Amino acid sequence: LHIPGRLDGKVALVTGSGRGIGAAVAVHLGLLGAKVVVNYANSPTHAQKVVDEIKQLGSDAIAIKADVRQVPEIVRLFDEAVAHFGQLDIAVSNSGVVSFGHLKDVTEEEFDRVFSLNTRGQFFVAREAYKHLNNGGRIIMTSSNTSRDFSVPKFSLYSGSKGAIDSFVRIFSKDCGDKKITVNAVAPGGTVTDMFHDVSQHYTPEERQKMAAHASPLHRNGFPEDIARVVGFLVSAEGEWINGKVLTVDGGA
Amino acid sequence: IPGRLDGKVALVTGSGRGIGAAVAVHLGLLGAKVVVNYANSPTHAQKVVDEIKQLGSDAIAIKADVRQVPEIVRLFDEAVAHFGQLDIAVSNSGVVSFGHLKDVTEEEFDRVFSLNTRGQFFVAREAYKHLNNGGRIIMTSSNTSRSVPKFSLYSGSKGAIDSFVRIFSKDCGDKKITVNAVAPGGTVTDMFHDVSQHYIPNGETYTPEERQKMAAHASPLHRNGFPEDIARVVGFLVSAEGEWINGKVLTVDGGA
Amino acid sequence: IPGRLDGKVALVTGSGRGIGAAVAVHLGLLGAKVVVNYANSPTHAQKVVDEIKQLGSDAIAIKADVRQVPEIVRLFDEAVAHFGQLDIAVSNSGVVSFGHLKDVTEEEFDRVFSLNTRGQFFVAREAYKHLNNGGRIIMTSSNTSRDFSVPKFSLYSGSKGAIDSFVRIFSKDCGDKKITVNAVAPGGTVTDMFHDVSQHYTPEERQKMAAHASPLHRNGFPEDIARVVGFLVSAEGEWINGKVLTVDGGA
Amino acid sequence: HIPGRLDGKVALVTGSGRGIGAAVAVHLGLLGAKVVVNYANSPTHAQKVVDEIKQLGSDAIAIKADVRQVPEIVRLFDEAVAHFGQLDIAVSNSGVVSFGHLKDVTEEEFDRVFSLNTRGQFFVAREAYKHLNNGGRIIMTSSNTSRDSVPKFSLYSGSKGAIDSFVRIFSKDCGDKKITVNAVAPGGTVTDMFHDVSQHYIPNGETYTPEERQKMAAHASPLHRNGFPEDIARVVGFLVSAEGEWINGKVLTVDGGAA
Ligand SMILES: NC(=O)c1ccc[n+]([C@@H]2O[C@H](COP(=O)([O-])OP(=O)(O)OC[C@H]3O[C@@H](n4cnc5c(N)ncnc54)[C@H](OP(=O)(O)O)[C@@H]3O)[C@@H](O)[C@H]2O)c1
Ligand SMILES: NC(=O)c1ccc[n+]([C@@H]2O[C@H](COP(=O)([O-])OP(=O)(O)OC[C@H]3O[C@@H](n4cnc5c(N)ncnc54)[C@H](OP(=O)(O)O)[C@@H]3O)[C@@H](O)[C@H]2O)c1
Ligand SMILES: NC(=O)c1ccc[n+]([C@@H]2O[C@H](COP(=O)([O-])OP(=O)(O)OC[C@H]3O[C@@H](n4cnc5c(N)ncnc54)[C@H](OP(=O)(O)O)[C@@H]3O)[C@@H](O)[C@H]2O)c1
Ligand SMILES: NC(=O)c1ccc[n+]([C@@H]2O[C@H](COP(=O)([O-])OP(=O)(O)OC[C@H]3O[C@@H](n4cnc5c(N)ncnc54)[C@H](OP(=O)(O)O)[C@@H]3O)[C@@H](O)[C@H]2O)c1
Ligand SMILES: O=C(CBr)c1ccc(Br)cc1O
Ligand SMILES: O=C(CBr)c1ccc(Br)cc1O
């Protein structure tokens, strides 16, 4: 009885996996039988619950605090991961922040807060992933359906921050080929997390939420484990021949 | 189990050979009962069926030429008759064409579009009609839609598919059926081989395998695409785990 | 002179009424001689021809069903016969179709594709064969090919997605006579077709709600699509080649 | 008829000292616009462009500003309105090219590219919106490699994909002033930047003359020729005209039909 997309005796790291989409990727890869490094930066207990979750279903994990806005903290994060589990097969760039505002009101402090994590951060996560990763490995980065599909106004700073991700992946896949490493991006849609709720107020968390379901031909919201399942396939052996691509997981939204 | 289709029934057009075949075998290995459609290759159709039984699923092989819209309806009513239900339809059948616009006859257009564009349209259609709720539709395109020369006619036949799927996914939502396309690129079959001989300044001079190996250099993974490479993306897409991929075109080429 | 077409001859399919009449009047305005192609509406076409005569450019009406290839061949033979040259060729003629995928018929698909897709391909081919060196080919798509996905618009959208793939490759084939190929992909240009899809109240009221879609707060008119077409097929538009230009004003 | 002329309009182009920007700025002048020739390090060529524009019956002025420093950007737009009294058109053109494998790419090298190409352009568009007449025009410059694959080109190509995403949303925001925002995505326009990129992506570039590698890239165009600054400037011309209005929020690629 053939079991697909498994990751047994493979190590995976997932920036900002304490809560939200990243935490499901952390678990899924754990379920499909990867050992998992669960990076957080502000949510220490949240991360220890994800380490706990992955252990209960028969694989190992350690949480590692790191601000991935800080390239040396990223060097240490990858340096520490390989120190612990011995190697690293999978690196998922998940960590991100949202911003809202009309072009006229967007400040220098605000451009940077956003770009420092979502774009520079993810790029430098990807850098140390290539240096630290084994041959046949997997980088995965997170964009947004807004990058180019969705056209939310007063969403320019955020969308641009992920538009750069869209352009990194097709080229990274050329560069990363000489360690036989595939690079792909996932562009989630409206995944239900603390972030989705902060961007719906633009009332109740769930009342707002109940509108977005009436917009997917599948009449439900996207949830973190809907994106996780697409990253699990992509970091599997099976899905090696998807390379340099931005997958969009929105449900037809 | 994740990625498995235990209890599910599928149908794959042009699954006697090439990507078609590898799709059918993969769906089987995942737990699906596979309908295997051919139009000219019953021997390989019957081999595909037999390989699907051996690994311990079930299959039949119903002859049907998907240019003929009544042969498509029959293909599907017979699909539902033999296994009882249909969950999954994979529109895969296709022909390549080559030529400069200046030398493209009517006959050559009608040949290419009747199967690649129109045929696939009325597979998607008779899929929606015949499918259980929560089911799955896949159509096959090419990475060359959105630029090798003398490749207009075929290229545009698949650009139409890239357009259809986004809308279909709107239409098809009311039975919660997801519709996506795969845009394969450089996959080792008689179609890839008959192509490599045209878009390589030597072509007939070199050997299919010598050409095949030239193209291996193109991928940053430094290898060739094989039907099992594509089969696996479809399988995920038609798993319940692939649900939240909907209305999209996945190019599977290896960075090419 | 800026993007003027003084000394050129153009041909526009379905230029009797619609964006085409406007592309025809526009290429006229910029000093081109214009073949005006109709199939069903000679009285409209005659209005266009006069309006191009009336701002001091020559023009003719030629009946041709761009679904019948033989008639495409005659139209291009006769156009070169009259003006002795053809520099620009605009594939405009198209039809609209609504329906859930479950309802679409072989007949409906073939009514659409015959003209929207297959017709445009063969206008394009015949353009290549008759066109002077350094000439121009425009094909007509929709912002729905890809950009937007409306329910029950699958057939039409497909018809124009085919076009998007054609122009990229066409631009390479046609470059062996230094001819550039592009599509403009309109997006709600007020016309007789808009009023159909608009319907799916009065026309003018179904437009006032349409206005709110553009961040420029206004709908689209043939001139909006025509100015772009005039640029692409000018000398100065040469370096735009093998492209789709979605003219929607935001939408 | 005299079509897309910009008579009585005022325009600003960043880095209109050399390359594309200059041809952009000479084009707007030729089309009747009064032009503000921004530059950071090339004051003489900037001045030659102002004189070349004054020569064809319009007016121009060179302002110095480094569009890496956001306060120099505000100073640039404040000064430009001060001199000519208004501004209709804003062309974010300034940019740099970088080559390197992800691994070799550094913090310093990364900030160097993003601070001008991405951050710079964003804030040129912020201040343009704040200074521009209603009915005006924002253009940003992108690249045909942002999404249209070239090795050791991630950092450059990245910097520009951010622009593509920016112009689609800028179109909406800028709509409350009936302002069209659009990007041009140039290909390999012959410039000192093209020659620096023809040196790296050619079998043995330094063993070749810039013209040699040029002729080589020409054989790759369906138009058997190299694109030139005037080829992009002609397209910018259309976009910023009354007539180009219904192209809003899109990214146009001017490449001659290939790389
Ligand atoms: N609807 C959506 O959610 C949606 C849609 C499109 C794209 N995305 C993208 O999906 C990704 C994740 O979204 P989400 O919904 O999961 O977000 P979220 O719930 O707000 O969670 C944020 C995650 O980011 C981590 N993080 C933030 N700043 C960090 C830093 N400097 N260093 C390390 N980690 C940091 C957080 O960990 P700590 O709490 O430990 O800081 C947390 O795990 C983001 O890139 C987002 O843009 C999401
Ligand atoms: N290989 C590639 O590189 C590549 C790249 C892009 C896209 N594709 C697409 O992938 C699909 C598979 O092609 P392939 O590579 O597998 O090539 P292939 O080996 O040529 O396969 C052709 C398949 O098409 C079926 N077919 C042909 N005419 C048919 C008809 N009237 N009715 C039903 N089925 C018919 C054939 O069945 P019989 O011959 O048995 O009748 C055969 O199984 C096609 O959609 C193709 O356009 C392939
Ligand atoms: N209008 C829009 O909002 C919109 C949006 C996206 C795309 N488009 C595209 O824009 C183009 C023009 O559409 P429109 O809005 O101007 O449409 P329209 O008002 O319906 O005009 C149709 C034009 O097509 C011609 N035509 C139809 N069938 C023909 C045939 N067999 N042979 C020759 N000519 C034929 C008509 O001429 P006869 O009357 O002589 O038959 C008429 O000139 C079309 O290709 C359409 O698909 C339009
Ligand atoms: N040429 C191509 O092949 C090509 C292809 C695709 C895209 N592009 C893009 O098109 C644009 C034009 O490139 P190009 O070929 O014209 O390049 P170029 O010859 O290098 O010209 C560079 C321009 O950038 C300006 N610049 C540099 N740093 C600046 C700063 N801090 N502030 C203001 N201006 C600054 C320069 O002015 P100073 O003299 O003052 O530095 C000069 O005007 C760039 O955005 C480029 O990325 C070019
Ligand atoms: O991207 C996000 C959250 Br960061 C998003 C939110 C709401 C909707 Br409706 C669509 C979206 O793409
Ligand atoms: O279409 C085919 C073979 Br039918 C194809 C082959 C190789 C590449 Br790279 C792209 C393609 O689209």
Ligand SMILES: O=C(CBr)c1ccc(Br)cc1O
């Ligand atoms: O398709 C049509 C008319 Br055929 C259309 C109408 C309105 C808008 Br907004 C976009 C469109 O594409």
Ligand SMILES: O=C(CBr)c1ccc(Br)cc1O
């Ligand atoms: O942008 C650059 C380097 Br500035 C470029 C050069 C040549 C070609 Br072909 C495409 C490009 O995008």
